[PDB]
Amino acid sequence: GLLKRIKTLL
Numbered sequence: 001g002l003l004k005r006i007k008t009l010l
């Protein structure tokens with residue numbers, strides 16, 4: 001989901 005993409009970004 002969308003928050004998993006943030007974990008990737010970081």
Ligand SMILES: CCCCCCCCCCCCOP(=O)([O-])OCC[N+](C)(C)C
Nearest residue numbers: 001002003004005006007008009010
């Ligand atoms: C990240 C969405 C937060 C809700 C507010 C935005 C509403 C519009 C987008 C809704 C997208 C659907 O998300 P989902 O696959 O059910 O997300 C599950 C997230 N957790 C694993 C942390 C429970």
Ligand SMILES: CCCCCCCCCCCCOP(=O)([O-])OCC[N+](C)(C)C
Nearest residue numbers: 001002003004005006007008009010
């Ligand atoms: C902000 C919350 C509003 C709630 C309004 C009442 C329920 C509406 C249910 C239908 C919601 C339909 O869209 P969704 O599957 O979530 O879109 C996901 C969009 N992305 C793929 C870009 C993450």
Ligand SMILES: CCCCCCCCCCCCOP(=O)([O-])OCC[N+](C)(C)C
Nearest residue numbers: 001002003004005006007008009010
């Ligand atoms: C308070 C809650 C209100 C509802 C919030 C819903 C947020 C949904 C965000 C969905 C973002 C999807 O972006 P994406 O497809 O990965 O971007 C692609 C970008 N380029 C074209 C430049 C490559």
Ligand SMILES: CCCCCCCCCCCCOP(=O)([O-])OCC[N+](C)(C)C
Nearest residue numbers: 001002003004005006007008009010
């Ligand atoms: C306007 C408000 C925007 C809110 C955006 C929320 C995004 C949430 C993303 C939540 C990701 C959780 O990752 P985590 O495993 O706890 O991260 C660990 C990070 N370090 C390795 C540096 C300690």
Ligand SMILES: CCCCCCCCCCCCOP(=O)([O-])OCC[N+](C)(C)C
Nearest residue numbers: 001002003004005006007008009010
């Ligand atoms: C942006 C915040 C989204 C919160 C969504 C919670 C939905 C329930 C998911 C199941 C419980 C997840 O484990 P928790 O208890 O959160 O422990 C993990 C805490 N960190 C992420 C900081 C490592």
Ligand SMILES: CCCCCCCCCCCCOP(=O)([O-])OCC[N+](C)(C)C
Nearest residue numbers: 001002003004005006007008009010
């Ligand atoms: C607009 C800015 C948006 C920023 C979004 C940030 C998302 C990531 C949040 C990560 C939260 C990290 O918490 P922490 O320091 O390890 O918790 C310390 C307290 N406890 C030990 C009780 C859990």
Ligand SMILES: CCCCCCCCCCCCOP(=O)([O-])OCC[N+](C)(C)C
Nearest residue numbers: 001002003004005006007008009010
């Ligand atoms: C002040 C607020 C600024 C908000 C910025 C929001 C945009 C974040 C964009 C994603 C950042 C991570 O990009 P990346 O996947 O590692 O690089 C490729 C990125 N493009 C495909 C778009 C070229």
Ligand SMILES: CCCCCCCCCCCCOP(=O)([O-])OCC[N+](C)(C)C
Nearest residue numbers: 001002003004005006007008009010
């Ligand atoms: C207008 C609203 C704009 C909101 C923009 C919010 C952006 C929040 C960004 C939060 C960044 C958290 O950094 P972090 O996990 O420690 O970094 C990764 C660190 N390592 C490389 C060592 C793993």
Ligand SMILES: CCCCCCCCCCCCOP(=O)([O-])OCC[N+](C)(C)C
Nearest residue numbers: 001002003004005006007008009010
């Ligand atoms: C892990 C990333 C956390 C932030 C996420 C939100 C922003 C993503 C868009 C990419 C931001 C890129 O910024 P930058 O021009 O290279 O940095 C400016 C600061 N310095 C001059 C010191 C390098």
Ligand SMILES: CCCCCCCCCCCCOP(=O)([O-])OCC[N+](C)(C)C
Nearest residue numbers: 001002003004005006007008009010
């Ligand atoms: C709507 C679209 C707007 C896009 C705006 C421009 C986004 C530019 C993203 C540039 C991302 C470059 O990431 P990188 O330094 O290779 O990896 C991250 C490395 N750190 C964790 C150390 C910071």
